[PDB]
Design a protein around this ligand. Structure first.
Ligand SMILES: Cc1cc2nc3c(=O)[nH]c(=O)nc-3n(C[C@H](O)[C@H](O)[C@H](O)COP(=O)(O)O)c2cc1C
Ligand SMILES: Cc1ccccc1-c1ccc(-c2cc(C(=O)O)c3c(c2)nnn3C)cc1
Ligand SMILES: CCCCCCCCCCC[N+](C)(C)[O-]
Ligand SMILES: CCCCCCCCCCC[N+](C)(C)[O-]
Ligand SMILES: CCCCCCCCCC[N+](C)(C)[O-]
Ligand SMILES: CCCCCCCCCC[N+](C)(C)[O-]
Ligand SMILES: O=C(O)c1cc(=O)[nH]c(=O)[nH]1
Ligand SMILES: [Cl-]
Ligand code: NA
Ligand code: NA
Ligand code: NA
Length: 365
């Protein structure tokens, strides 16, 4: 352990959390990150951490999950923090405010967060201009193994979700290495029912058709992000449609609307998606199931409650090619990225794996 990790986890982050409400802390974090005001990223990525997936090289397999940088403002500072890939969003076609405040809650005794932001978004046009302004810099980053993903949502007033997602494909698809069809937000009425078989097949057919109409050089991979709250029938159906249509990968999982037994935080009954440690093994089991249902043929990005190298390796061994985190950053701060990477490398070596690639799906073999 480095000095920063302990100092941030034991002194800096508790003091910030005592001074600022959760959404103010989030906005300040985005601002400091966007300006590069961040502790010295003291970890050199070993070649063991490199992963080739989704038509790209990833210098390390630890990404920032959607929701931290909703409007594409802090992309370069997130690479400086040490993430191997960045996902921005969710972005909706038109700007919209999201739910009334308060809409984010800390559950520190659970190492968890509840949020009901409701897709607060600057809109596609604003994000489009932000990404265009650094598009060549991102081309170089991607070439160097630091790809960019864009997570697409839908407006609250939209009549047909498929036209919302199609517009996101047309506008931000050419600026992304991969797109994410977010059909699993718990905070937009009726959104998650897009996960059922008949609506999903029509929706994803339209999204793939639009993606295929982009010029080859600007054509992203398309992934679907699913909830952890699905029935077995839902998961079977999603796996079936993903394979029938040639979807490029899955993100597993979004936040949960459940409230597992044992939560201690005073705010556990707030409405919203729960993230962090109480989500961890629910997410890992959903990875394990979706990997088996897709025969290991569909790349998975595993996400939910990762704060250590062991947590990351469990998801990789369950079938994730890549992992993301968000909530751990809100408790440990920026040092958590280097921490997860260093512990993952040590554990790979300890378990006899030549690299991350050899551990993907290793529990199933
Ligand atoms: C405050 C907050 C906002 C989020 N907003 C989004 C979002 O806009 N789009 C999305 O697909 N996921 C969103 N998520 C979900 C995360 O991307 C991730 O799936 C989830 O939080 C589990 O990972 P974690 O336990 O490491 O935080 C949000 C999470 C949090 C905590
Ligand atoms: C300390 C620091 C230095 C340089 C750059 C960034 C940081 C930093 C500081 C705060 C956070 C943070 C905190 C919280 C919270 O609830 O307390 C969040 C968050 C981010 N996003 N959502 N929420 C609820 C993240 C990172
Ligand atoms: C009517 C639409 C007005 C613009 C959309 C609102 C943007 C919300 C900004 C919140 C940013 N953040 C995720 C960091 O809290
Ligand atoms: C306070 C940090 C604790 C980390 C581990 C907490 C255990 C969380 C268990 C999740 C609940 N579950 C869905 C599995 O029943
Ligand atoms: C988001 C609030 C952060 C407060 C503390 C941030 C410390 C800044 C890191 C130090 N330095 C600028 C040299 O990277
Ligand atoms: C082909 C090798 C696959 C895994 C080997 C290393 C695993 C070490 C721990 C195994 N375990 C005791 C947890 O079942
Ligand atoms: O904007 C939000 O409320 C939000 C979106 C999403 O996909 N997941 C989440 O937990 N929150
Ligand atoms: Cl373009
Ligand atoms: Na805000
Ligand atoms: Na089944
Ligand atoms: Na099908």
């Amino acid at each position: 352990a480095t000095g920063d990790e302990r100092f941030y986890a034991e002194h800096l982050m508790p003091t910030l959390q005592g001074l600022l409400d959760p959404e103010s802390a989030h906005r300040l974090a985005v601002r400091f990150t966007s300006l590069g005001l961040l502790p010295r990223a003291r970890f050199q990525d070993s070649d063991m951490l490199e992963v080739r997936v989704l038509g790209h090289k990833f210098r390390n397999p630890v990404g920032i999950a959607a929701g931290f940088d909703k409007h594409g403002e802090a992309v370069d500072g997130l690479y400086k923090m040490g993430f191997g890939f960045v996902e921005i969003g969710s972005v909706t076609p038109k700007p919209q405010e999201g739910n009334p405040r308060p809409r984010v809650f800390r559950l520190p005794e659970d190492q968890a967060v509840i949020n009901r932001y409701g897709f607060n978004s600057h809109g596609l046009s604003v994000v489009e201009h932000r990404l265009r302004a650094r598009q060549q810099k991102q081309a170089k980053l991607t070439e160097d193994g630091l790809p960019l993903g864009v997570n697409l949502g839908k407006n609250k007033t939209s009549v047909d979700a498929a036209e919302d997602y199609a517009e996101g494909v047309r506008v931000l698809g050419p600026l992304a290495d991969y797109l994410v069809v977010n059909v699993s937000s718990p905070n937009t009425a009726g959104l998650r029912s897009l996960q059922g078989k008949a609506e999903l097949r029509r929706l994803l057919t339209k999204v793939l058709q639009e993606r295929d109409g982009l010029r080859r050089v600007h054509r992203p991979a398309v992934l679907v992000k699913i909830a952890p709250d699905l029935t077995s029938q839902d998961k079977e159906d999603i796996a079936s449609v993903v394979k029938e249509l040639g979807i490029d990968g899955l993100i597993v999982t979004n936040t949960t609307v459940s409230r597992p037994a044992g939560l201690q935080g005073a705010l556990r009954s707030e409405t919203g998606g729960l993230s962090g440690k109480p989500l961890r093994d629910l997410s890992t089991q959903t990875i394990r199931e979706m990997y088996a249902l897709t025969q290991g043929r569909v790349p998975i990005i595993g996400v939910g409650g990762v704060s250590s190298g062991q947590d990351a390796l469990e998801k990789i061994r369950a079938g994730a090619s890549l992992v993301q985190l968000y909530t751990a950053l809100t408790f440990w701060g920026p040092p958590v990225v280097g921490k997860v990477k260093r512990e993952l490398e040590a554990l790979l070596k300890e378990q006899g794996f030549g690299g991350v690639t050899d551990a993907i799906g290793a529990d199933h073999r």
